[PDB]
Design a protein around this ligand. Structure first.
Ligand SMILES: Nc1ncnc2c1ncn2[C@@H]1O[C@H](COP(=O)(O)OP(=O)(O)NP(=O)(O)O)[C@@H](O)[C@H]1O
Ligand SMILES: Nc1nc2c(ncn2[C@@H]2O[C@H](COP(=O)(O)OP(=O)(O)O)[C@@H](O)[C@H]2O)c(=O)[nH]1
Ligand SMILES: Nc1nc2c(ncn2[C@@H]2O[C@H](COP(=O)(O)OP(=O)(O)O)[C@@H](O)[C@H]2O)c(=O)[nH]1
Ligand SMILES: [Mg+2]
Ligand SMILES: [Mg+2]
Ligand SMILES: [Mg+2]
Lengths: 149, 149, 149
């Protein structure tokens, strides 16, 4: 049984030109690209994306940092929501484990390269926010017999 | 004082075409390739390899998944039995530490890319099962003075 | 607020020809190269460098193993003293976390590839020992807005 998670490369990932390296880490585990789109995030969509932080003092500066080019992604795999969070590492790069994206690429939480859904409910909500159903692509990986039990 | 461990790239490592990447991880630490052989694992040899699991319900499907091309390897180094196990990571990739082979490449225990001996006794048994003595090569690494104390 | 740490590639890092790989790991986090110099370490300077270890049983052999080409480096970043130590990993490569330099490249404490300052005080002292102030270069990284909060 597979699930789908929402992963988003933030503007610092675009501007530091590590998009391909990020994608390769997820492809390396046999996770399937189910959707992908480059866009420029707007405050209106970011307010909904970060609805959990509404009213908090840091929300205006988070939205400002995120107003820029982003790569919206959906990846599919076993336990991929929790696993992608593990691969990303802790919010604060200095506390993230070696070998995670944030530890390997970043210094501070405010520029930590990538977002990933933190739960099944948030993944469903975030995928629906950033993608229309017609943009989610269903196909089978040819190596499936060697990736899955 | 060095020891030798038996490492085997399973059919998923061959079919996903990551053999060279796996070998490079062990070469990177200055471990010496003492033996290397491509073969196709058969049920009779796999029954002896997995003798500890005889009779268990999961063994038949394990043998089926392992019936395929494998790369038999012997690596030599300080504490290499335990260290190779650490490098592979937990049997279940989702529990494996970031930076390990199974965490970086895999999703499920039944397709977890690689086997390594779990003890000195199993290394001796497994090397004897999969290799003839003529296939174990004795030579010295030229960089030894910069690898070992 | 950024700080500066002293990092030194030991003779095993030079001789195994992994200098570039080491530098890339620090550049990948947006750490800035503030100083860099190839020299051959001599006992007199190494005695001052390792002054804290005076009298310990491994010191004479440590000085012998360190008498050779070294790459002196200063890197700048947020919390870079502690973070570089985390990236290097434990003194013993066998205890170091997967994904650290020592775990990925080495086997034994006596050949563990790299030195890094362990504190703000030792970083100040080591930078002054190996570099004159005129050798420390100040410039701003063009991607600073995407590395720092
Ligand atoms: N619950 C399970 N479900 C699926 N496959 C399993 C399970 N438990 C074990 N396996 C498979 O059987 C192998 C042998 O189990 P075990 O010897 O306990 O793990 P290991 O030593 O980490 N791996 P191996 O290289 O096969 O010896 C595992 O590597 C998996 O490929
Ligand atoms: N500067 C700064 N940014 C933060 C802090 N906490 C969170 N953020 C930013 O806000 C984003 C969303 O916060 P959160 O959902 O709690 O963290 P995440 O799930 O790891 O992305 C993070 O990824 C960070 O970029 C903080 O303490 N300082
Ligand atoms: N052979 C050997 N070398 C050691 C030992 N302890 C320390 N060293 C070496 O001495 C160096 C400096 O020691 P220390 O400052 O404690 O370790 P570091 O801060 O991790 O570099 C280490 O990096 C090792 O190369 C030991 O027990 N045996
Ligand atoms: Mg979050
Ligand atoms: Mg076993
Ligand atoms: Mg020290």
């Amino acid at each position: 049984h597979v699930e789908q998670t929402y992963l988003m490369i933030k503007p610092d990932g675009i501007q530091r030109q590590v998009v391909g390296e990020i994608i390769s880490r997820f492809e390396k585990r046999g996770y399937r690209i189910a959707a992908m789109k480059l866009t420029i995030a707007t405050p209106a969509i970011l307010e909904e994306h970060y609805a959990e932080h509404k009213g908090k003092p840091f929300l205006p500066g988070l939205i400002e940092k995120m107003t820029g080019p982003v790569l919206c992604m959906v990846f599919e795999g076993v336990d991929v929501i929790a696993q992608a969070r593990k691969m990303m590492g802790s919010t604060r790069p200095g506390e993230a484990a070696p070998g995670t994206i944030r530890a390997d690429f970043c210094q501070q939480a405010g520029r930590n390269l990538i977002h990933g859904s933190d739960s099944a409910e948030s993944a469903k909500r975030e995928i629906s926010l950033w993608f229309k159903p017609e943009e989610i692509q269903s196909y089978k990986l040819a190596l499936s017999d060697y990736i899955f039990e």
